[PDB]
Design a protein around this ligand. Structure first.
Ligand SMILES: Nc1ncnc2c1ncn2[C@@H]1O[C@H](COP(=O)(O)OP(=O)(O)OP(=O)(O)O)[C@@H](O)[C@H]1O
Ligand SMILES: Nc1ncnc2c1ncn2[C@@H]1O[C@H](COP(=O)(O)OP(=O)(O)OP(=O)(O)O)[C@@H](O)[C@H]1O
Ligand SMILES: Nc1ncnc2c1ncn2[C@@H]1O[C@H](COP(=O)(O)OP(=O)(O)OP(=O)(O)O)[C@@H](O)[C@H]1O
Ligand SMILES: Nc1ncnc2c1ncn2[C@@H]1O[C@H](COP(=O)(O)OP(=O)(O)OP(=O)(O)O)[C@@H](O)[C@H]1O
Lengths: 451, 451, 451, 451
């Protein structure tokens, strides 16, 4: 038994929607009314204390048009025989399971009209297929569906928890403790969680993320969120960055903290309320992009990636290099991992001429894959020429020549990135940040704003 | 007129306390009862709708011992004559201002005993000095103190706002918008703010931070928080880091993101609930430490600093270097900025021998200031020998020799810090993180835990 | 269709009780808890909004012993075919009416145990006989019993009203208007009424009076109250006297207002709180007793009758007399109406000798029916010798000789009854009222007190 | 000290009213809003918990016109020195009692305007005369008027009780017990009582009755109600009749129960809702009228008196008679008690000729005081010719000739009044009751209806 999907046709803010499910579902978003009414739809399906009051006039979509409320839940009941819950649901049914090789089982809610006696009359049915459903046999005030499930609702037998906004009047470390108790522990096998706090998602795994969109009409995006085997050692700082990234609409994926220093200076000199409108700067370091990108893509969040063209030397060999910054974007568009590039380099002068011939080989590599770079730029993936300091030299290079007394300011900024980045931020004006922001190689910051 | 201090002697959780004030006071902490009763003490001093009900038996410290409730507020009323509020308070008083060259004015609340008629009888007095106070003359239900001030209390004439927990059922960007409206705008000249969210302090300036301690007895620490003129370009990312650091008890100050990757791997292999007990990793990059350290020191938060011995070359000259990592700790202990150190370096071999002779000069500089290093280590300031990769080589250097096929793993890790740090984290065990954590040059992580 | 009886076995204050019913039932008494729980038992039988909440632990008689709640209602459904409600109940049933010549139909409530899941599970059944009942077929939240009846509950489809205490914050004439609207008008065919006010029963006819007794255990007495054809001209002053008599426990039935003056003087000189303990003086004038006596007997109220031996002359004949005061008590014990007694009286002296020979003939009639008088006295019926002034002469006759200056005070008191009764009350002492109250011919006043 | 009057000028339903007071004040009527706002005016004068909230906009008479609320209470403080409350009020005042021979002391409430700050600011003053009042000196939240009095408000130090509607959900004998505890016992020296039940006034003495009239404008009538020394033996049945008479508007004062039988038959054959509109039949027997008439006159209730011309023989003498029915109406208009009338009567025929010559002497007495009878009829006092049976003979005498087979039906009805009155009621039609009601000697029943 594993919760597959719930079909909410007619309810307070729903028309013909499907939400895919698994166990441990998490709903979040900016529409508070849809996050309330999703848990109210689950309480009308599976709790006696909400279903015994019936339907009012307020819980209809249009009050005279499409007057048939249906909630259908999908269970997928064929599983291995050592599971207790599969036997506990198949023992209660008698003729609702018709053929023993069937796989899918439905719990179908139906309602009648409201125009006479001002009442809903919720009617619940069982069966293995959608046509020829059979009524659930009850005798008094207790249905036979109520002898299977149990619902506990938390606000500040197969057991389904419903936790609504647990961060209210709560400290930060208690929210991280509640996140660790929710996902790592096996106390809560089935829940549905609504939250506004990113500290309640610092340890999340094997879960559905449900994002409710910011529109007035309810749009639901669902993702089967997992952390893979190679990502398990950098897992919780990835979850700490991504849990703050889940409450945004437009997210820029950067690498360094000095990039955050420079871009945040350019942002509060140009667009000083980017954090109010839904912008977020996400630091991604030392990993590939596609675990972030599949999560934000299936949750409907626009992902913008700014990256540099890096050359990585491998272990045990000298003079052979890997095309790392190409291969991350090739993994993002689903293509295969590229081959080895070897460069024959002498001893030469090691301080600057080796860096200059590596920059010239990166310039030739950026030249001969120009249509692939445009393909990446076609989306929100932006690959730099050599680095971002050399893209910064093409915009404010006279300013970098007049702040520092050195002749070459790019090498002086690359000698110590953080302290000379703070010295570049401190002697900077408004027109320099507009020269950075208006440039064609820093277009992605405009894609962070979008207005 | 400027709010100096409030003396709460007898109230629900107070004995003889003083809290220093300014305008725009912010109270935070883990004692919710003291943060409620501070605003209740201000409502009993300055609001009619709480003062007209009197005192019960529950708002006494001991119910039979020390039965004299006093709230005394300090105003410091001498100011320039173009201020409207100084004239609006000095026009109402007639004989309470005795001598015209006086500076300090008091608003003194007093209460009587509770053992007969079960009532408090709050009595309010004026005067320029603490002895020979005069009664405030009123006529009916309205006091003459009520013709000066006005109190608006917000829960989800000189005007004093009182905002209690505004982040409840609220989105993140609305909390950042409320922070920008609270501190940058001049709509709220006087307030007292209680919060649990770090996003309500992302733009804070010219304010009192009040930290209520985690003990059962109420301890109040207050700091006159300001951002100086040289720190104004890196101001709001400093406030974003420090606002999450204000809700912790033990804070480690680090520099890089790769240090956060390595230390966070060592932390969830050794002490996996450090974030639950009050630990926090704070990234400080490119700035001096003392603006963080004066704020956390006057708020009573233990600050732990891990830093490396850096040599910084200056602009316009070659072969002369600055002792930057010494001078940050010398600024932390209040000593003067050190002189210039020049090193005569030939052309040599630029790739490794220049780095080796710079490491040997840093080793000699760490040798000849050994008593200063112990002095720093005497507190929570920890200065590394060359870097933290060389301190990591002394603990897990056989592991770094067996992961990478290179002969020297320190130079390979310093070639690309982030990606080889993720490769060092991925091939790492429990005993390697215990070898890092048990070492004498990584003692500060134990100071992050303290248990 | 006509409501016959309700059998409440297990409920909050009931063990195996039966209450006989008709349409327009009225419940009254001093047990407020039983008058609340009777209407709660009807709401649990016939209202959806009480039956959907189920049973708690508090609505059981003993919480572990006799755990089977049964409410059975009797309908007697065979009637003439022009009644709409008989066809509206027989159209809904299909197989619950088995044989077409059956007369009695039952609505049977049943409940299960409470020791597991803390719930009652009310189960409702139909059928023509008590064994082999069939379940009421429903489909959702709406039963098929709910498609017949409708319950409106009033507190300050076949339609059943439930009015609980309508005299609260209400004027007296509005209570008399509500009584006239309740019983004379045909707006309320079916109701159940609880009241504390006697002005809500000033016009009552064709109704059940239900008296709940003053004990802690619930005792229900029911009477089919009607006013007959010969009593219809003196009907509403009889209802005004009897409606105040229904809220008492011990009621003395007297005739004159001068008897009320004398007995009320004797009562506040002997037992000054007789009205507090449940005593009531009821004036019955010009009628027979048995309409009062059948109502108070079937409602369980002890009726005490004090009466005089009267001789009534008939119309159109002279010298023949009727034994009226004997025949009222003979009608009370169910015996036949006695014959005519003729007395041959000359012209004589008309003022006193005719009254003396009529008193001697009444003394001979009281002599020769002595065993019948004892039979009446055996109950609470007390027949005087001649009048009550002559019984008053045997107790306080020296006091009546010393107040009035006339030789014969009985004839002077019978000349003007009211004004000389006020003159006898005004010159009276405590020992004279104890001489009246301790006498053997005024024992019935002691039967008014009983303690 | 004795409460004299309260002057409520501006309040919710008051303009310039005076209500005279004593101790033990009782307010009753049909305006529930005025009975609520009288106790709210006393709570605003004398209770801290209502006065500390101030005045809203709703408790003004006109919201912009006559914006000065004044409540002035009169105390009359000069009394004998053994009274404790006089010394307890004169000890608290210091200069408010100016001259020691003064008698009257005032408690003056004043209020300010409401158009700025939305507040009332109740100001209380003391002094011996109405001009040159002095402020009551207080120090904090407690006034010095609050150190004298104490107010307890009951809803289902000098101590003032306020009991509002205590008959709600209460039995009848508990209301009579509460009446006996209120007036006979000295537990409640000062109260103000509002009620709707006549059983809470069955033992009332030494009290103010306040009747609030049925109009929308508040009219207050007050009477100093007492029972005199000669009326003390018939006191509580007089209070039982008069307490039901206090809740009516038009009251007919009759004598016998047979008059109630006949008039109540004529009333439900002509005006069947006389009890709904405010009519009441009051039985007065054996007493004079003026104790009822002074109470109903000072309470503003229209009193209608129907009486017969009676001749009363005195004690110890024969042949001399008293003009009783004249002298009750002469006491009602305040004239002196008339002399003795002697009639020389022989032995004659005692049965009918003595009654005929007494009726002829009553006819001559009704002839020679014709202008006095018209004077009585000028008001609502109606004196019959001989009796009311002889006035009934002039209207329905052919009906009385056709019901009874006797030749003279007046003597047959006067032989037994009650049983032949029930026989006259039983054989009666609608046109006979219209012949009674339309007659000029039964005009007072029309004065009972008035429409
Ligand atoms: N002044 C310079 N002129 C030319 N090349 C330089 C200069 N400084 C540094 N480089 C280049 O930078 C490379 C790396 O620098 P190096 O290993 O000497 O460390 P560093 O930055 O001088 O040391 P530290 O970080 O301790 O200040 C050198 O191999 C050399 O090619
Ligand atoms: N294989 C090596 N052997 C010895 N020294 C090396 C080696 N690789 C790098 N270095 C040292 O590191 C210094 C800085 O490296 P360099 O400027 O050549 O960039 P890089 O790390 O090779 O380039 P990129 O970042 O594009 O991969 C050199 O001046 C040299 O002293
Ligand atoms: N003084 C008396 N002595 C003897 N018998 C009397 C006396 N007074 C009245 N009676 C008797 O009472 C009977 C009825 O009284 P009657 O008809 O004379 O009226 P009343 O009571 O005198 O009149 P009223 O009611 O007008 O005062 C008489 O027939 C007579 O037998
Ligand atoms: N049939 C009659 N004819 C004439 N006068 C009568 C008649 N009956 C009664 N009376 C008058 O009524 C007066 C009072 O009546 P009386 O004393 O005889 O009592 P009663 O009414 O006959 O007795 P009881 O009340 O026991 O029936 C008599 O004195 C007489 O004058």
């Amino acid at each position: 038994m594993k919760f597959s999907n719930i079909t909410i046709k007619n309810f307070r803010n729903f028309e013909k929607v499907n939400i895919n499910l698994d166990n441990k579902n998490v709903i979040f978003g900016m529409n508070d009314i849809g996050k309330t009414n999703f848990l109210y739809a689950l309480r009308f399906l599976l709790d006696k204390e909400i279903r015994k009051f019936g339907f009012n006039k307020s819980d209809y979509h249009k009050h005279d048009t499409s007057k048939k409320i249906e909630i259908i839940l999908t269970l997928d009941l064929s599983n291995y025989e050592k599971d207790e819950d599969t036997k506990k649901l198949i023992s209660v049914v008698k003729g609702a399971r018709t053929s023993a090789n069937a796989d899918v089982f439905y719990i179908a809610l139906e309602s009648k009209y409201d125009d006479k006696e001002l009442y809903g009359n919720i009617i619940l049915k069982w069966g293995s297929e959608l046509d020829n459903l059979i009524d659930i046999p009850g005798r008094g005030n207790i249905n036979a569906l109520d002898n299977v499930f149990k619902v506990i609702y938390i606000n500040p037998k197969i057991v389904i928890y419903l936790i609504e906004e647990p961060e209210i009047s709560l400290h930060r470390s208690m929210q991280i403790a509640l996140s660790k108790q929710l996902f790592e522990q096996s106390t809560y096998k089935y829940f549905f969680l609504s939250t506004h706090s990113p500290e309640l998602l610092y340890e999340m795994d094997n879960t559905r993320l449900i994002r409710v969109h910011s529109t007035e009409k309810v749009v639901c995006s669902s993702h089967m969120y997992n952390v893979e085997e190679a990502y398990g050692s950098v897992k919780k700082k990835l979850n700490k960055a991504l849990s703050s990234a889940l409450f945004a609409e437009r997210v820029l994926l950067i690498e360094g903290p000095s990039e955050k220093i420079l871009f945040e200076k350019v942002l509060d000199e140009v667009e000083p309320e980017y954090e109010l409108n839904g912008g977020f700067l996400l630091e991604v370091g030392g990993t590939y992009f596609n675990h972030y990108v599949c999560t934000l893509n299936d949750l409907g969040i626009t992902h913008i990636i700014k990256t540099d063209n890096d050359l990585k030397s491998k272990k045990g060999k000298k003079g052979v290099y890997e095309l790392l910054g190409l291969n991350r974007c090739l993994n993002l568009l689903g293509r295969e991992n590229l081959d080895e590039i070897t460069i024959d380099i002498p001893e030469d002068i090691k301080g600057k001429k080796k860096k200059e011939r590596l920059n010239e080989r990166k310039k030739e590599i950026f030249k001969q894959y120009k249509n692939e770079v445009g393909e990446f730029l076609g989306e929100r993936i932006y690959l730099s020429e050599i680095d971002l300091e050399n893209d910064l030299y093409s915009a404010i290079g006279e300013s970098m020549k007049r702040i520092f007394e050195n002749e070459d300011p790019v090498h002086y900024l690359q000698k110590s990135k953080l302290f000379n980045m703070v010295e570049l931020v401190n002697n900077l004006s408004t027109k320099d940040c507009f020269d950075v922001f208006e440039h064609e190689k820093f277009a992605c910051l405009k894609e962070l704003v979008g207005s």
